């Protein structure tokens, strides 16, 4: 029902809600929060389980509290979601697969997943399928291909064969000619992942990833257009 | 009135008995209406197979001659956005019949052109008002239909029209007109139809026009090819034989002469040659790979225009190079 490609309809964040002047105003202070870490979440889940020791012991789930607490801690950084999941598990006499709310991955996290792969998953096909199923909005945007193009050199601080870089860049060039079909994005990401997995080694030191600089070029082009119109 | 109509419309089936080729679907739907247990329907198939005709005939049979008063028909020519689904379709499906004539019917022709949001809104409208209303969705491309909508509809596939049904309809048309069709002309018409009745009727009308005196002149295969400007099988066979046996100069001259004799287009020659080669028994499979890939590339290039002579020479060279593998 939206069919709109503006910033706000894509992401709900301070940048899309506020503007540059407000954020950079000297009288406004911005503090960024991180997901609650495993230690604090585990501590508070144990506290809650202790507060409900009687019912847990009566239901015979007290002995298994540590297992579910540890699983919940590694699955989310949302305290409310963790508490809700714990309540759902404890109040259940039967056994069900414990699951929390899904968490989206960031842009640089997706770039890192494509370049280096995922620790949890060893099958690249499964990783790519999950990435496209859950992060379609991020992958579809054309800035992701530009990010891959501008960051693939970070692998081993750019100490791999020119042949692999040529293969990756040629694949991206071919994908740019596919009118933005999903097959194009899938093929590009799969090519990058396969190429980097073919040369992955323990003794590698990687570089720093950066956002693509196309926006700077666009601004410079606009300034050039204004100057050229003045000259004309 | 009907006499002035194009044949594709003048010969539109009025009753289900006039629909040919889809025996299984017609049988099942007729029994469903006989028992009055019609479910939500999906008619999936390629162009000109009888979907719209079948649904209109079924509506006529259910409601007799007054079907226009209790049937809501919508197609791609009408706006069918989410607002339309929420207001118009919803109100029609949620209101009583004109004279308590059982259930109401909503036909969504060419529903593959509807937006995802409208299709999503349709789910609960279909589900909640099933007692009073039944939906019919017609489509040629299933991938445009959301999974939820597909799950809700009983699916019927309209196959490409078999040869026998086309022959029967051609006989009916020939009797209705004062026309005479030769067996070879009928075979050519069936071959070029590709299972679409509309093409059959249009070509028949053009052939009747081509005749100087249709009251006594008979349509032959030559008339069909003249009307369609299509190559004859002999032309295709000669071109292929020259390509596979004669030298480059002779093959080029043969192709040029065959095309210039009747102004044949290269795409139709390629399609006929592909049909011929599909039945060829090749001992080397790599030959098939080369043939298919190169000819598909040539067809795609022709689709955008380009140089005709270069494309013809490319076809010749591609066939020769591919068949060098069989050596």
């Amino acid at each position: 029902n939206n069919y709109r490609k503006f910033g706000i309809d894509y992401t709900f964040s301070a940048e899309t809600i506020m503007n540059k002047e407000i954020l950079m105003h000297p009288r406004l202070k911005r503090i960024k929060f991180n997901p609650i870490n495993s230690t604090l979440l585990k501590k508070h889940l144990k506290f809650i389980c202790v507060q409900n020791m009687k019912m847990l012991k009566e239901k015979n789930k007290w002995n298994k509290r540590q297992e579910v607490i540890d699983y919940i801690a590694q699955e989310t950084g949302d305290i409310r979601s963790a508490i809700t999941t714990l309540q759902f598990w404890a109040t259940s006499s039967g056994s069900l697969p414990i699951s929390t709310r899904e968490s989206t991955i960031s842009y640089f996290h997706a770039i890192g997943k494509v370049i280096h792969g995922s620790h949890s998953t060893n099958n690249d096909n499964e990783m790519i399928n999950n990435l496209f199923e859950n992060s379609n909005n991020l992958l579809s945007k054309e800035d992701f291909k530009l990010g891959i193009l501008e960051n693939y050199n970070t692998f081993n601080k750019g100490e791999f064969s020119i042949s692999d870089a040529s293969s990756i860049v040629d694949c991206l060039s071919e994908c740019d000619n596919m009118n933005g079909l999903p097959e194009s994005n899938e093929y590009g990401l799969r090519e990058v992942r396969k190429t980097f997995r073919n040369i992955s080694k323990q003794g590698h030191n990687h570089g720093t990833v950066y956002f693509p600089r196309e926006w700077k070029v666009r601004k410079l082009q606009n300034s050039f257009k204004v100057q050229a119109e003045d000259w004309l | 009135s009907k006499e002035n109509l194009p044949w594709v419309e003048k010969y539109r089936p009025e009753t289900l008995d006039e629909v040919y080729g889809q025996n299984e679907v017609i049988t099942t739907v007729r029994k469903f209406v006989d028992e009055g247990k019609l479910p939500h329907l999906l008619f999936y198939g390629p162009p000109g197979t009888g979907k719209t005709s079948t649904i209109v005939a079924l509506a006529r049979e259910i409601y007799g001659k007054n079907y226009s008063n209790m049937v809501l028909e919508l197609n791609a020519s009408d706006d069918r956005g989410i607002d339309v689904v929420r207001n118009q379709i919803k109100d029609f499906a949620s209101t009583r019949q004109i004279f308590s004539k059982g259930f109401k019917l909503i036909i969504l022709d060419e529903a593959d052109a509807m937006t995802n949001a409208a299709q999503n809104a349709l789910r609960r409208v279909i589900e909640r008002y099933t007692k009073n209303t039944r939906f019919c969705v017609l489509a040629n491309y299933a991938h445009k239909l959301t999974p939820a909508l597909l799950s809700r509809c009983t699916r019927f596939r309209f196959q490409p029209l078999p040869q026998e049904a086309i022959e029967r309809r051609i006989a009916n048309v020939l009797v209705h007109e004062k026309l005479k069709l030769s067996p070879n002309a009928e075979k050519a018409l069936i071959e070029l139809s590709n299972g679409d009745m509309r093409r059959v009727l249009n070509v028949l009308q053009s052939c009747k026009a081509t005749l100087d005196n249709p009251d006594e002149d008979e349509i032959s295969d030559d008339v069909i090819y003249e009307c369609c400007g299509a190559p004859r099988p002999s032309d295709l066979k000669a071109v292929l034989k020259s390509i596979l046996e004669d030298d480059w100069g002779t093959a080029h001259y043969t192709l040029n002469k065959v095309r210039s004799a009747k102004g044949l287009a290269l795409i139709d020659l390629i399609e006929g040659i592909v049909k011929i080669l599909e039945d060829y028994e090749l001992q080397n499979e790599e030959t098939r790979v080369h043939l298919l890939t190169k000819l598909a590339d040539i067809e795609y290039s022709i689709s955008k225009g380009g140089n005709d002579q270069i494309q013809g020479s490319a076809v010749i060279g591609a066939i020769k190079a591919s068949f060098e593998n069989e050596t």
Partner: protein, 354 residues
């Protein structure tokens, strides 16, 4: 004062000094301009196509065609994206560059040109009885850069309203022109001037400006450095004369466009080193070039031929280079972002050299 490119620009067909056969053909066209067909002039950039079109118009109408003024026309898209276009006008003709509108060029064809085509130009007769009718002349600059939709929109406008309008399109290459538009036009090939004619024009300019020239060879060198672009030849002549106190000498350096020198440096860097880091620096250079609005295809041409000019490379290297250049030129034509294809070309060249 005005630049020498415009100061000594010929203002009539008789003033043209190179490609005599083309001048004769244009004069034959001007003999009976009553039934002049639509024209499409194609040839290398900077050869004098626009000058010849203006000379033809002057022959048909008169010197007043050079009394040009500028107007701004506003267009609104289906998304309410207001924008503007510059329309140059003389009492007898109009000049537009719809390609400056990007993908919106079609709007210009659908709204402006059509309206111009529909409004029939009539005027009271000074001496005779009744109104007199005259067709309007419209020049479409950078015709080859129009989108296929705009070119399609041109067709029936050209055909139906042939009584009121006559189009003169100018392009540097006819490859991007759709077949129907070419079919609707009289095609005129405009060859570039030879080195001798460029040298003669430059010598006439030098004599007019009273610039001391040690030897005529300098002019020849200037010609050989312009690659047949007369406008560039005159610009470099003026720059060199000003930079040398209006005294040219055999030792005076030839001034070339800065981006050309940058591309030469990039070619040398590519030849010298072939590695990932070299590729990243090449990306930086390419982005710097693109920031100045240099077209991607132009960059690809200049880089390709600069690479082909390297003496150390062998036949296989150059053959592979030209193959990759053709492939990536097609990819640029069919692509959306040029950086991918330029990077791919450079990476392929690095692989083939190494």
């Amino acid at each position: 004062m005005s630049l020498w490119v415009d100061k000594y620009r010929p203002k009539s067909l008789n003033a043209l000094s190179h490609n005599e056969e083309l001048t004769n053909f244009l004069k034959s066209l001007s003999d009976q301009p009553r039934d002049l067909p639509h024209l499409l002039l194609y040839g290398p950039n900077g050869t004098g196509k626009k000058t010849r079109c203006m000379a033809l118009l002057e022959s048909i109408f008169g010197p007043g065609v050079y009394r040009l003024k500028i107007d701004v026309r506003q267009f609104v898209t289906a998304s309410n994206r207001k924008l503007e276009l510059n329309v140059v006008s003389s009492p007898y003709h109009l000049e537009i560059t719809p390609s400056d509108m990007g993908n919106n060029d079609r709007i210009v064809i659908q709204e402006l040109l059509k309206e111009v085509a529909q409004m029939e130009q009539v005027d009271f007769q000074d001496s005779k009885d009744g109104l007199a009718h005259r067709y309007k002349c419209v020049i479409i600059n950078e015709a080859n850069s129009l989108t296929k939709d705009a070119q399609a929109a041109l067709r029936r406008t050209m055909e139906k309203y042939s009584k009121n309008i006559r189009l003169i399109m100018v392009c540097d290459s006819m490859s991007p022109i759709i077949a129907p538009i070419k079919s609707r036009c009289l095609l005129i090939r405009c060859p570039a001037p030879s080195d001798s004619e460029i040298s003669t024009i430059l010598s006439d300019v030098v004599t007019n400006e009273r610039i001391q020239l040690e030897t005529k060879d300098i002019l020849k060198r200037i010609a050989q450095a312009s690659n047949g672009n007369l406008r560039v030849s005159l610009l470099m002549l003026e720059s060199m004369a000003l930079n040398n106190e209006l005294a040219l000498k055999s030792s005076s350096p030839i001034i070339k466009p800065d981006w050309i020198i940058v591309i030469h440096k990039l070619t040398r860097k590519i030849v010298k080193e072939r590695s990932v880091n070299s590729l990243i620096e090449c990306r930086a250079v390419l982005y710097d070039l693109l920031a100045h609005c240099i077209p991607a295809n132009i960059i690809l041409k200049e880089l390709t031929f600069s690479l082909l000019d390297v003496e150390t490379l062998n036949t296989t290297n150059k053959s592979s280079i030209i193959e990759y250049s053709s492939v990536f030129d097609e990819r640029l034509s069919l692509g959306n972002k040029a950086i991918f294809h330029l990077e791919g070309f450079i990476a392929k060249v690095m692989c083939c050299l190494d």
